[PDB]
Amino acid sequence: GSDEEIRKKLEELAKRKGKDLQLRRYNDPNEVEKSIREALKKGRTLIIIINGVFVVVSTDEDLIREIKRLIKESNPNKKTLDVTTEEDLEEVLRRIKKGSWSLEHHHHHH
């Protein structure tokens, strides 16, 4: 679907900045967690789709914040998440259960 239309914006950005970006889909928090440990240990960017939520993992906040924009251009109605440590993963998954999900809106971003 629209994940294939966003993939171009991400894989072009990998050539612009010289970092490794890759896109994958998951069904459960228990399966997805295993992918975050690899990305953070290796200093790499993963863009993950789980149950309609976009979870962005990177050791570079400037890579996440540009990916979030490129995701939200193509799906302005989709919810999003960000991770830079294995502690951030638990922080955001705890917020997912509590309803404290991301508030990325262009009138709030400025």
Find how far residue 19's CA is from the centre of its chain: 15
Whose CA is closest to 47, among 16, 11, 17, 95?
A: 11
The dihedral through the CA atoms of 89, 90, 94, 100 has a sign that is negative
CB within 8 Å of 45: residues ≥ 6 apart: 14, 19, 20, 21, 22, 39, 56, 57, 58, 60, 63, 64, 67
How many Å from the N-terminal Cα to the C-terminal Cα in the chain?
30
The answer to whether the CB of 63 falls within 8 A of the CB of 17 is yes
- The domain locations on the chain are 2-97
DSSP at 28? -
Q: Does domain 2-97 have CATH number 3.30.70?
A: yes
H and E: helices and strands count for the chain = 5, 4
